[PDB]
Enzyme design. Structure first.
Site, mmCIF file in Angstrom:
data_model
loop_
_atom_site.group_PDB
_atom_site.id
_atom_site.type_symbol
_atom_site.label_atom_id
_atom_site.label_comp_id
_atom_site.label_asym_id
_atom_site.label_seq_id
_atom_site.Cartn_x
_atom_site.Cartn_y
_atom_site.Cartn_z
ATOM 1 N N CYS A 1 0.834 -1.398 -0.007
ATOM 2 C CA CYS A 1 -0.012 -0.091 0.032
ATOM 3 C C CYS A 1 0.908 1.230 -0.036
ATOM 4 O O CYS A 1 1.643 1.401 1.016
ATOM 5 C CB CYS A 1 -0.912 0.059 1.136
ATOM 6 S SG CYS A 1 -2.334 1.304 1.049
ATOM 7 N N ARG B 1 0.110 4.454 2.909
ATOM 8 C CA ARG B 1 0.059 4.298 4.514
ATOM 9 C C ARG B 1 0.587 5.567 5.142
ATOM 10 O O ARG B 1 0.273 5.260 6.611
ATOM 11 C CB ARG B 1 0.851 2.864 4.945
ATOM 12 C CG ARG B 1 0.430 1.800 4.306
ATOM 13 C CD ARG B 1 1.553 0.486 4.581
ATOM 14 N NE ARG B 1 2.685 0.475 3.539
ATOM 15 C CZ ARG B 1 3.912 -0.236 3.510
ATOM 16 N NH1 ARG B 1 4.068 -0.652 4.800
ATOM 17 N NH2 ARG B 1 4.718 -0.170 2.714
ATOM 18 N N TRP C 1 -9.049 6.233 -0.952
ATOM 19 C CA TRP C 1 -9.100 7.044 -2.537
ATOM 20 C C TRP C 1 -8.308 6.582 -3.311
ATOM 21 O O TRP C 1 -7.111 6.091 -3.190
ATOM 22 C CB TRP C 1 -9.423 8.650 -2.011
ATOM 23 C CG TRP C 1 -7.963 9.094 -1.218
ATOM 24 C CD1 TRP C 1 -6.841 9.196 -1.920
ATOM 25 C CD2 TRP C 1 -7.920 9.228 0.107
ATOM 26 N NE1 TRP C 1 -5.659 9.665 -0.980
ATOM 27 C CE2 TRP C 1 -6.544 9.588 0.468
ATOM 28 C CE3 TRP C 1 -8.681 9.371 1.207
ATOM 29 C CZ2 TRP C 1 -5.936 10.057 1.426
ATOM 30 C CZ3 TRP C 1 -8.032 9.759 2.362
ATOM 31 C CH2 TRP C 1 -7.002 10.215 2.408
ATOM 32 N N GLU D 1 -3.877 4.090 -11.055
ATOM 33 C CA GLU D 1 -4.320 2.825 -10.903
ATOM 34 C C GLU D 1 -5.486 3.052 -11.992
ATOM 35 O O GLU D 1 -5.743 1.789 -12.572
ATOM 36 C CB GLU D 1 -4.938 2.746 -9.308
ATOM 37 C CG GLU D 1 -4.160 2.463 -8.127
ATOM 38 C CD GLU D 1 -4.997 2.714 -6.673
ATOM 39 O OE1 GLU D 1 -5.737 1.573 -6.419
ATOM 40 O OE2 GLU D 1 -4.934 3.598 -5.970
#
Ligand code: HEM
Ligand code: HEM
Ligand SMILES: Fc1cccc(CCCNCCc2ccnc(-n3ccnc3)n2)c1
Ligand SMILES: Fc1cccc(CCCNCCc2ccnc(-n3ccnc3)n2)c1
Ligand SMILES: C[C@H](O)[C@H](O)[C@H]1CNc2nc(N)[nH]c(=O)c2N1
Ligand SMILES: C[C@H](O)[C@H](O)[C@H]1CNc2nc(N)[nH]c(=O)c2N1
Ligand SMILES: [Zn+2]
EC number: 1.14.13.39
Lengths: 405, 405
Positions: free
Chosen positions: B109, B112, B281, B286
């Site tokens: 991730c 973070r 979000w 992506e």
């Protein structure tokens, strides 16, 4: 399924198993507890014999005479040679095979589709620094070939018990100077500040440009290194222009044609060749993204973006992305115009997939360093991004070695 | 001997000593590195107990009460319950702590920095697909927040040795349909062909657009899953336009606001939560790069290139790189204009660097997956490219689990 690492391609859904990796003798940085694959610095008596033996077996397999009389005599010959001298020597064609195989084995090189077409210059008779220079010049002339580039390596004498090494001090055969300024900034390439200062401490008269070609500092066994200046007409360069932004040529950017790595150790059958420069032709992002755009290299991204009039005040303008694209295009365009061999990151990674598929059929696997093979711009746009890779060390190998100073 | 983690732009070095707390194995071993694999290959009571104690210790330490009455009494509670039942249950505030810590520990991730701000919905008192739906709807409503997004997780009831798991069959709460055409092709999103087929087969009436929002299959233990259509008004979507390319909106592209992962298992203190969907979000690449430009996704790069009028017939025109850049720009512009939370990959990675720094200070390291953290375009243009990273598994953890069908 089989008990070998399962390798997956996520664009195409296809699976393979790497069986090659079982032939990995030397370990990598990873344990079952933590992944050190992203870290860039990867940290004999009877031990030589077993590496030698294993190498001679590789040579014999690759000529399909494995188990032959010729095979069993060569092994006995290497036993006996190690026996009375502590070392042994390679037949000419054993060195040619070992060199291509070192290239074939290199996890980080994306040009490996070419591995079979490598000109091996055998320079194990070299006995002086002056003689290394001639051999290097010959290399440069042959590999450059007026812009029609040709893969090549030159192998100088192997490390020898007690006697000092042949070393080229420069990390490449062509490198630009990096001059530290009073204001603490650097003129030229920040990557080369140290080797620049060494060339000066060794009597080179330093220029003060952005793109001064370095002299070579060459070292023959047990002798201080000596300085050799490359005659400018041997060192082919390409001025950078952009196919449509007319002002980009006014930036006075340039890059040399020949990418020639000169400070890696070539290890064959346990013998160590401390001086063995090799060269290919550039993949375009090595120049347009790493060398020109890294913050700690030429760092030209802001300048190009300002000329393109981008909003450099905000990350979400994607000004970095746009400038980097245009710089890469300029590099591609200018090498094309100049007729100097070069390959874009798309063509390169496509050929590298073809490579993987060839090695899958030929040896059942191919060691590959995903972080290095995926290009620094446009990653998931290239097919390697979607390809899993297994990384391991196979020998013959190209290895890093401590700087000689 | 510990991991030395180096930054290649700034030259600075840290040591990861957090990995010393890794109990679980990653896909790698001495002889071969496996870290670029998306799925690592795998996809008594004192075991559970030592995981429990360990988590219980983490919790009390977190609140600075490590040795309190409250601490020892919580450990006996846990102990007594496992000894007698083979399992135990978490207090809500432990759950809250565990969920934040699972996010904190997720190596892949990039978001973070945000880990301390996570709205946790306790839905462990859920008992039917219908109850699951209601809670999922409140999650979406809360997290979406009219476009000003907020991080959330809803946690359904833990696995029980007895029986089947609570599962959400969809991999995300919002996903577009992919309809296979009798002639090879897919209309909609090719990544969702299977889940689209399962929905139809459990009796949903399919549309036939490129952007048909899927219903959810929710499954209570040992029951056939059931179908729930999300009410359009909960699913905020952002139509894609480009700040200057007027034709670009004509492409009829859009994307959803809420990125919510619904197939991952959340493991706290040895307890397993098989339905625990979470959302933050989007990072723009992506959507702009992977979802719309992956060859095996919406694959729109050629359409855009052709509108931009580029030389499609040659890789070296860098048509792919140009198109991708504008498509990502279009996504950022469009979410900005709709006022929907989004972060571009430059801001995101800058804030992840700050994160690594906070984590070094707080824990002596941070597990991170380089290949995931570095964005899919403009890699080395982001600071994370230049940063070495150590990947390892800490618990609490989010994990993959088998598709339930
Ligand atoms: C034929 C054209 C070639 C291309 C396009 C090519 C491409 C590349 C690239 C892009 C890299 C990574 C460079 C970096 O980012 O530092 C690389 C690394 C490498 N290449 Fe090549 N290469 C070529 C030829 C060769 C040849 C001829 C050899 C040796 C005979 C070779 C051996 C290596 C090795 C050892 C590395 C890794 C060096 C390191 O770890 O720093 N390559 N190659
Ligand atoms: C706050 C905004 C957030 C941003 C910008 C963000 C960013 C990202 C990105 C880019 C990825 C890789 C996605 C992919 O390529 O599949 C990712 C993966 C992940 N994120 Fe986030 N994230 C956010 C919030 C959260 C939250 C709230 C959680 C959980 C509480 C979370 C947990 C994860 C996990 C577990 C993964 C790994 C997913 C996988 O392996 O497929 N993230 N994140
Ligand atoms: F300080 C460092 C420690 C370890 C690696 C580093 C990266 C530089 C070496 N990468 C090789 C770059 C390079 C340059 C020219 N040519 C090639 N080349 C030639 C053929 N194939 C690749 N490769 C720095
Ligand atoms: F085949 C596979 C099995 C499991 C994961 C895979 C990778 C894709 C899914 N990764 C998460 C994608 C995703 C989507 C929306 N949102 C997030 N998200 C939300 C917060 N952080 C990430 N992440 C392939
Ligand atoms: C930390 C990271 O390993 C480092 O930046 C790597 C990433 N990928 C690379 N890839 C190539 N081809 N060359 C490099 O020098 C690097 N550097
Ligand atoms: C094979 C490779 O690991 C695979 O393409 C990975 C690479 N990095 C990624 N990184 C992110 N953030 N998301 C992904 O899906 C992937 N895919
Ligand atoms: Zn690894």
């Amino acid at each position: 399924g089989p008990k070998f690492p399962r390798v997956k391609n996520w664009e195409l859904g296809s699976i393979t198993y790497d069986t090659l990796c079982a032939q990995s003798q030397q370990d990598g940085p990873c344990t079952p507890r933590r992944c050190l694959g992203s870290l860039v610095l990867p940290r004999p008596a009877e031990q030589l014999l077993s590496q030698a033996r294993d190498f001679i077996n590789q040579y014999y397999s690759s000529i399909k005479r494995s188990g032959s009389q010729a095979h069993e005599e060569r092994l006995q010959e290497v036993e006996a040679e190690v026996a009375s001298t502590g070392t042994y020597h390679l037949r000419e064609s054993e060195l040619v095979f070992g060199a291509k195989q070192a290239w074939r084995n290199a996890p980080r090189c994306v040009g490996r589709i070419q591995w079979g077409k490598l000109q091996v210059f055998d320079a194990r008779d070299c006995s002086s620094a002056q003689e290394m220079f001639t051999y290097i010049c010959n290399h440069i002339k042959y590999a450059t070939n007026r812009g029609n580039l040709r893969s090549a390596i030159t192998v100088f004498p192997q490390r020898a018990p007690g006697r000092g090494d042949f070393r080229i001090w420069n990390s490449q055969l062509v490198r630009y100077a990096g001059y530290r300024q009073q204001d603490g900034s650097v003129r030229g390439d920040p990557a080369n500040v140290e080797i620049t200062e060494l060339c000066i401490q060794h009597g080179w008269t330093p220029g003060n440009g952005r793109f001064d070609v370095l002299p070579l500092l060459l070292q023959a066994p047990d002798e201080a290194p000596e300085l050799f200046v490359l005659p400018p007409e041997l060192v082919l360069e390409v001025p950078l222009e952009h196919p449509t932004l007319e002002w980009f040529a006014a930036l006075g950017l340039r890059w040399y044609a020949l990418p020639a790595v000169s400070n890696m150790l070539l290890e064959i059958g346990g013998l160590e060749f401390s001086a063995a420069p090799f060269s290919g032709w550039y993949m375009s992002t090595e120049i347009g993204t790493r060398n020109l755009c890294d913050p700690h290299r030429y760092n030209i991204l802001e300048d190009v973006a300002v000329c393109m009039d981008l909003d450099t005040r905000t990350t979400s303008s994607l000004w970095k992305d746009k400038a980097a694209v245009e710089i890469n295009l300029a590099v591609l365009h200018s090498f094309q115009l100049a007729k100097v061999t070069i390959v874009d990151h798309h063509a390169a990674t496509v050929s590298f997939m073809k490579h993987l598929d060839n090695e899958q059929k030929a040896r059942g696997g191919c060691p590959a360093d995903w972080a290095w093979i995926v290009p620094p711009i446009s990653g998931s746009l290239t097919p390697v991004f979607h390809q899993e890779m297994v990384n391991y060390i196979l020998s013959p190998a190209f290895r890093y070695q401590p700087d000689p100073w």
